[PDB]
Short mmCIF file of C-alpha atoms and ligand atoms in Angstrom, two decimals:
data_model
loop_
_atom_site.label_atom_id
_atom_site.label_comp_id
_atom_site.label_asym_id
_atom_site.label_seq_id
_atom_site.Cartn_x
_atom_site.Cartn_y
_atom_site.Cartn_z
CA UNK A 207 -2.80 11.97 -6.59
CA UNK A 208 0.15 11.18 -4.07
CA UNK A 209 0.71 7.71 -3.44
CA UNK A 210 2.68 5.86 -1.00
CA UNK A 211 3.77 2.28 -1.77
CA UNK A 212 5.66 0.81 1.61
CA UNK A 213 6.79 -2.81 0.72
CA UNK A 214 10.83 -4.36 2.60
CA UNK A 215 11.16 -6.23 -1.55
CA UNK A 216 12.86 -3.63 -3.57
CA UNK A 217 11.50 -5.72 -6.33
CA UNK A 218 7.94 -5.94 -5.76
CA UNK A 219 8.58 -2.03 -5.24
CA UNK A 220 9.58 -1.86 -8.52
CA UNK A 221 6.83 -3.94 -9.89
CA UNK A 222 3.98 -1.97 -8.50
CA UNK A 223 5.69 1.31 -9.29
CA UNK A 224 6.04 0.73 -12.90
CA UNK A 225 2.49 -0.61 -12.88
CA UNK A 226 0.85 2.65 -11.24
CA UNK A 227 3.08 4.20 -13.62
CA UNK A 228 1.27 2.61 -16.52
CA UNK A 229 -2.16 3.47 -15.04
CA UNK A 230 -0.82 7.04 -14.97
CA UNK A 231 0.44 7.43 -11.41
CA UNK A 232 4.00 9.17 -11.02
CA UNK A 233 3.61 10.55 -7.56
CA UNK A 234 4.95 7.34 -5.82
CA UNK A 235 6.49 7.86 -3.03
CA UNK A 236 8.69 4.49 -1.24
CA UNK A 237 9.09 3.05 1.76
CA UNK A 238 10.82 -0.01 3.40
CA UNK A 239 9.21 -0.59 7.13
CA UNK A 240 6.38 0.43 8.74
CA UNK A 241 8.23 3.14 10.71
CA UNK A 242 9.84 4.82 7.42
CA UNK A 243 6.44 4.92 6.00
CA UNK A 244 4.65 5.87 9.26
CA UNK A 245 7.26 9.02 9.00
CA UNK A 246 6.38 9.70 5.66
CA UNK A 247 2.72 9.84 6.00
CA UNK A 248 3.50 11.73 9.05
CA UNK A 249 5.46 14.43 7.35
CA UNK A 250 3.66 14.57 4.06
CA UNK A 251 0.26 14.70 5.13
CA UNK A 252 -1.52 15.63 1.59
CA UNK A 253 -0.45 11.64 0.80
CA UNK A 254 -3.80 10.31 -0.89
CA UNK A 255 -3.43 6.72 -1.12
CA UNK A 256 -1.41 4.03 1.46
CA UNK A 257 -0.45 0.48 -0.65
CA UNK A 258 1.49 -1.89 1.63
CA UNK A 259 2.85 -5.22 2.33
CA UNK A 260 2.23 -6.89 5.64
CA UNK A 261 5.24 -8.47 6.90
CA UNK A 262 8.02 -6.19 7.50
CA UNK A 263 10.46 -5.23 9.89
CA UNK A 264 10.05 -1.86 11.48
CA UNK A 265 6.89 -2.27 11.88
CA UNK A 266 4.60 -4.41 10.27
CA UNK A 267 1.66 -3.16 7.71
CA UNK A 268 -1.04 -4.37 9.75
CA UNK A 269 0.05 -1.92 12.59
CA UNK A 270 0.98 0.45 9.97
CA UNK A 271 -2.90 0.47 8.83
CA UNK A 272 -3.87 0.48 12.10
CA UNK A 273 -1.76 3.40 13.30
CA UNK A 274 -2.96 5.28 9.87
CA UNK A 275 -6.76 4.79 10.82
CA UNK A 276 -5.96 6.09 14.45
CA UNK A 277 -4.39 9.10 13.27
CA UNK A 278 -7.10 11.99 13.01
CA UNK A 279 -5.96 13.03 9.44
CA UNK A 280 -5.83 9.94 7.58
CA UNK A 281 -9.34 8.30 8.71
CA UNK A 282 -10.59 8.36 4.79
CA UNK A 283 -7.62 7.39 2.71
CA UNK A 284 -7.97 4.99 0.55
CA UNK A 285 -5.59 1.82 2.05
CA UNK A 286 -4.59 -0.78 0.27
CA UNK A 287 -2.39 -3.82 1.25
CA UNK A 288 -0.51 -6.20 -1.49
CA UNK A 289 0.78 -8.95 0.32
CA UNK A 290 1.57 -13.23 0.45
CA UNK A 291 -1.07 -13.54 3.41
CA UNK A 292 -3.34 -15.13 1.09
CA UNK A 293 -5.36 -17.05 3.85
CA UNK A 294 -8.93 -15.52 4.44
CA UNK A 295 -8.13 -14.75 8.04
CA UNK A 296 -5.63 -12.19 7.46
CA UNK A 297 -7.65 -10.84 4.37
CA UNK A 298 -10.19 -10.44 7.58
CA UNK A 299 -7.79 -9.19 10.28
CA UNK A 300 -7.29 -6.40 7.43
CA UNK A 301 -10.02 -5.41 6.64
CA UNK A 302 -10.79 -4.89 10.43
CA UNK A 303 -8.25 -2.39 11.00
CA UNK A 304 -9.33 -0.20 7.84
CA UNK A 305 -7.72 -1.98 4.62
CA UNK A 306 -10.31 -1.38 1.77
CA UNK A 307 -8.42 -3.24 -1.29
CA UNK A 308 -6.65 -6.51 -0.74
CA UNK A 309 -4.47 -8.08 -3.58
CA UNK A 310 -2.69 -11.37 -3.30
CA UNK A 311 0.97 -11.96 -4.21
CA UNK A 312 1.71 -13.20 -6.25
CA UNK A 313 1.28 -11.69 -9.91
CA UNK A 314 2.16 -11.29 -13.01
CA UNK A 315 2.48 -7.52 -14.14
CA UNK A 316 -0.23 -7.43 -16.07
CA UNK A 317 -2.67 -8.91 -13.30
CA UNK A 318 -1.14 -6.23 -11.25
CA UNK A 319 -1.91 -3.48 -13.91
CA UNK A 320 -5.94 -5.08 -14.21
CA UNK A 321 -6.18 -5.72 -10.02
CA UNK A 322 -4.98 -1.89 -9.48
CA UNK A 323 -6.75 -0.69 -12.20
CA UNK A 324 -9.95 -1.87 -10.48
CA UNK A 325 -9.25 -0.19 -7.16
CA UNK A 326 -7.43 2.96 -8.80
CA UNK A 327 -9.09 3.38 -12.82
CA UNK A 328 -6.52 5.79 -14.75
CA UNK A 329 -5.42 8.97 -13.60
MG1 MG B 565 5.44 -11.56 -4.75
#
């Protein structure tokens, strides 16, 4: 279970790291930008699940997602985005270009740990 977390807030990164950590997730692999993440699900192919942010230099995480579901070998991972954009518009726009979970910043840890837990279980 490979996951990629691509978010520019090296605290948020943290956050959601130590919280699929607690759900039993240690194959987390980082990213900054959209491009550095692109690369990484580029090069290491066998990832299983995208989570990103939206906004983000280098690319943002809507045209990340949209670039994923494009690509011929990542039409059925599981995407999903953790971001401010709590209006209902941009929970839309996402879902359009192939998010399937959308959590609003922002949390505590523990609503983190119950919202992922939801999409994710224990592994
Ligand atoms: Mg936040």
């Amino acid at each position: 279970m490979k996951l990629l977390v691509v978010d520019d807030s090296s605290t948020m990164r943290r956050i959601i790291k130590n919280t699929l950590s607690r759900l039993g997730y240690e194959d987390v692999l980082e990213a900054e930008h959209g491009v550095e993440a692109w690369e990484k699900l580029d090069a290491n192919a066998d990832t299983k699940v995208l989570i990103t942010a939206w906004n983000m230099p280098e690319m943002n995480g809507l045209d990340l997602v949209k670039k994923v579901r494009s690509d011929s070998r990542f039409k059925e991972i599981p995407i999903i985005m953790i971001t401010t954009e709590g209006g209902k518009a941009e929970v839309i726009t996402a879902l359009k270009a192939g998010v399937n979970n959308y959590i609003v910043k922002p949390f505590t840890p523990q609503v983190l740990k119950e919202k992922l837990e939801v999409v994710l279980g224990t592994n």
